[PDB]
Amino acid sequence: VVHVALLPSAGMGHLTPFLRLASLLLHQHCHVTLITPQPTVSKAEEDLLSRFLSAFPQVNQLHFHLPPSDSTISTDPFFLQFASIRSSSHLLTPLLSSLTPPLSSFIYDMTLISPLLPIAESLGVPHYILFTSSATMFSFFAYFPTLAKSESFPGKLDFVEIPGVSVSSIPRSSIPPPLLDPNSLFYKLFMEDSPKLKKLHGVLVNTFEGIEKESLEALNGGKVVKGLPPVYGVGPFVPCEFEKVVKRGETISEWLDEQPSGSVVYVSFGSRTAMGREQLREVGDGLVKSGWRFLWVVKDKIVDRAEEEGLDGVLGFELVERMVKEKKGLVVKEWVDQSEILGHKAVGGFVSHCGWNSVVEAAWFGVPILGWPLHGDQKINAEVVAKGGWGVWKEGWGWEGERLVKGEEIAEAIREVMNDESLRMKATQVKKDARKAISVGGSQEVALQKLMEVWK
Template sequence: MEAKTHIAIVTVPVYSHLRSILEFAKRLVHLHHDIHVTCINPTFGSACNNTKALFESLPSTINYTFLPPINLEDLPHDTHPAIQVQVTILCSLPLIYDALKTLHASTRLVAIISDGLISQVLPFGKELNTLSYTYFPSTAMLLSLCLYSSMLDKTISCEYKDLLEPMEIPGCIPIHGTDLPDPLQDRSGVEYKQFLEGNERFYLADGILVNNFFEMEEETIRALQQEEGRGIPSVYAIGPFVQKGSCNEGSDTECLRWLDKQQHSSVLYVSFGSGGTLSHDQINELALGLELSGQGFLWVLRPPNKFGIIANIGAEIEDPFKFLPNGFVKRTEGRGLVVPYWASQVEILGHRAIGGFLCHCGWNSTLEAVVRGIPIIAWPLFAEQKMNAVLLTNGLKVALRVKVNKKGIVEREEVAKVIQNLIVGEEGEEIRQRMKKLEGVATDALKDDGSSTITLTQLAHKWRGLSLGVA
């Protein structure tokens, strides 16, 4: 029998965002078998194997369609990946609307859920006379900043990075202006204007679904929910959504076999997400810091990139080992393992040998650490990652943050010190205990009577009622 309740999800061609929203879709249909989901996916270029694997792992109650690829040949060859995504989104909007209109005519959609990066879709819900939601794959803290950004823009006259005191965002811990997302570091730039415009569109949403659980950001979520009915959309904490295992069959098991030989909680896992990269100088300092620390490590290494991010995570063009210090691999043999480009992070973080995670504080990676109780060394690179680092270190106190010198480099001595503090120090043990408690709360949130499950079920009941014609 065909499902009566039909939801459309509109994604963006960003691997980390795809992972998050597809995990949400899988959780939704797992809990509510009568809900059917169709994913509409804007594209540019050809999908890499990692992206294909995400879609091929979806259950039968989730359909997906890839829109015709957007031609980006008119853009300069060295265009930043973020701009490529923005152009793809803008050029895909007519295609998205047509796809939604066709889908609505044949299945009567009860809701459209679009990724937070593509808030231009929100007005389509009103045009099609259906509910329209934003899926927000980051923190409630960032959401609060987004929703109050216009107010902050009117009340603060200087550049945020020049503020002498930490900023007060409603419901959030204080944060220095230098730790705000990249678009807010230059208020005269195009990115800042686009940031404000996108945030204003959030107010068109019938609700905002946040990939976090109530107990992790209780004060922030409560503050947002108290403003419902006074302009701010309803906020639903329904996470955490993380991958349960690798989507790639036959993924490399070398690192897992190596971990099997290591002592319990003795290894630091080092990775900067699905595409983050470091400069050559920073790779050198990180390597020498790992060596100096004397601790075990498993490092996913990528070559430098001028943007600090690899657009095509499936591309393995350059040998990253040539950027390591001479003799580093030989000197750390047995104690450390360097893996080029990619490793199965979900499986690695679940291994008994992992005692810490040096990461960029991307939200997917952060939640993967939380649900496995792995303490963090925060090394933010771009986007909202510095905000996430502030939440983890100052708010939840489950991470140590590296200090950057005046040239923007984390020096080897700093690397060694923070690793030792986390893996064998007293401070690290206190952080580990707090993270273990947070792991338990995250697990509870996804139980049948947990806060996230109850919230998602309430939404599902609302959508089911609409499909049956119940107001």
Template sequence: MATPATKSLGELDSGARPHVMFIPSAGMGHLLPFFRFIASLAGHDDDVDISVVTVLPTVSAAEADHFNSLFAALPHVRRVDLHLLPLNASEFPSHDRDPFIVRWEALRRSAHLLGPLIAGAAPRVSAVITDVTLTSYVIPIAKELGVPCHVLFISCATMLSLNAYFPLHLDKKKKAEQHEQGLAGGIGDVDIPGVRRIPWSCLPQPLLDLNKLFTKQFIDNGRENINADGFLVNTFDALEPAALAALRDGKVVPGFPPVYAIGPLRSQQHSNSAAAEVEKEEDSSPVAWLDKQPARSVVYVAFGNRSAVSHAQIREIAAGLEASGCRFLWVLKTTKVDRDDSAELTDVLGEGFLERLQLGQHGLVTKAWVDQEALLKHPSVGLYLSHSGWNSVTEAAAAGVPLLAWPRGGDHRVNAMVAVSGGVGVWMEHWSWDGEDWLVTAEEIGKKVREVMSDAAVRARATRTGEEAAKAVAEGGTSYRSMQQFISTLKATGHSDLIQPLH
């Protein structure tokens, strides 16, 4: 149902304008691309009705704040609340209790509630855009209703090719009765036609175990992808030419739906709300500190919204940054869910570290929310030490800032491959990631930070990639044209037959 601050779907004027209903998932890494795409669509064309399914309760305070900011900034965007059915996380094995993977499963099990929301909307829904984590449930519902269903894929095109091809890879291995003993239970490397070979060591860790909840979701969604009406991907042609060409030409999966490269998605000027302004005020300290630093002298350090690094590794990072001799701004996170992040900086970083920073004025550590996109564009930032989540890769690419990739889990190693091949940065392939119980030492971290900060060739490649990113989204660019093509598709569906009744 609609919140009091927004119009209900039944209050809308009917007409030929296409009405697009967005169905995002959970986790800020998934939500931010949705928010940016919604703002971009609203900015490109005001002749499109937009509604957004808001899943309640949200996993984190950050999610709730960003939803509120979206609706405050874009009052013509309608909010449709979906209250999840109860799900007891204890029914899953302990290794499947990641709060976000559990949320995706709760969404999938409540997906049947979307049918009445879509069918009952007025004006009628002419297209649905869903998160890839929900495709195996949402696409069949949309098809039954006769509504086109597009997927906003929040990772790279290379990862999309893996998601689409992985079920075929498993089928081929089963058919050939290949059992590669010792290689991650027989999963082996995945050689994606027309794209690249993904070593098994670079696959998202859960995919190495076919019994994991995430793996089952991944396979189900991958099989259903072929039935989507199109994929919107937060990338651009110059960054992933091979993967995009292979998907579009049907080399990965014959007959794959149209793929629109619409990135890098960026925050829109008008998307700021009163809530966001308060957050920016809280961020004035990091920005003010950056303003005092020389050009390209600061290493920005952040490992994403859900990548928690162990306290022991955090202390090695701290010592390494200090030993590097480089200025740094570190946005530190110690838990996967923000409401659980109550650790004091002094306890995490060790006695004396913050005091030395204050005296030397060459570093700043914060746990506050920051506008990462804006920080990366700050002239003082010269390097980004990152987990290589896809939002972070595209933000670094757009800013022309070199990325030092330290993948932590999930799609991060696949993203790091793209970051290297696309000229965004460099990847320390032997550095540890989630599940490995050894530490990267302070000495190695400090040495690598110094090395990349002084590497003119790395910086030049990142600058060129930034220029290509700017060309892509500028009028006439590849991503701009893809967006226009997609909007034309939406408008064509706005005049199609009436929605089919639910059976």
């Protein structure tokens, strides 16, 4: 009996790939202990966890209760759990060592590598990180101590050239701004965590050769960093049935059934809102001006804090009236089944902030992407898609809040992506490779067996 322990970080962007990896390991007949930091931050995490545990009642949920963290750096509830874990991870050792059956391996989130590395070494089992973003973004993370020691860093630097990765030249404009400030916490965490990769037994990435061939080969051939552990491309993590909410109104699917094939552009900027009010108006104005059918999924401005503000409060009355007249667009404020949407033949395009889970899903369903990266890794992820030729993004729009992107710019970008058959044909090729990756003898099965060979 192979026993694997899993510890995701906070946020749907981390919990979703971890529960999909858990599903993959259960199919390989592993016994899975899912470590759950408590109290969980968001309701969406609560609901997905209960839906997951219901679908797989054989998995053992180990509750990891966290004392309250009071930090002067940030009040964000997601950051405060992260602060709790790296100050109170000593509590995990008794819960993990005194555990039956004996653990065979430990897989935790890459963001928790500093607190969890001594915990894993005290358990004496093969331990790994699951990185929830692209292999190209991981290459940047692994290369960062080398990059920060250059005299070009930070002012002179124009392009970051990491040997052999899928994005050969990363401009300074695509680097997350805090990583250019040696005084930022982000910079400090990268400089502390990246050298610890050598202590790991391996790195798991939700990616496949069909989208990141160069980055995966560069990471595994000692090209990016000397002494890196093996990097396992175990993607794509395909959506699972337990994610689907049990009782949905079906009205979104019923609306998609009434549109022509490839007619609808789907817009989602991620699990949470990272976009200001003035920019959100311009988004709705751009969708109406584009002339294309659209399904725009918006989130609550603050997580789990609903408001009575109308859609004309956000977008303005005339924009809303023109929308209901032309009959071409839906705007919903809810947690949708994004896989049901991307898998529908009426959807011909995806306006995405390029969070990596949404990028892999679009690859799985062969939907071309109009990238609107906002923060963090998203500009690097968007260029991974652009390099593959199944997506496009406007590098001049900037990080979120740098400038106001007008509705006419947005409409012209939408019309560009929705009319480009070259992007659609390349996305269909990416989809074919994504389907091959999870077939029998495909890259995902090969990579999983290579992991399972050590465990037992």
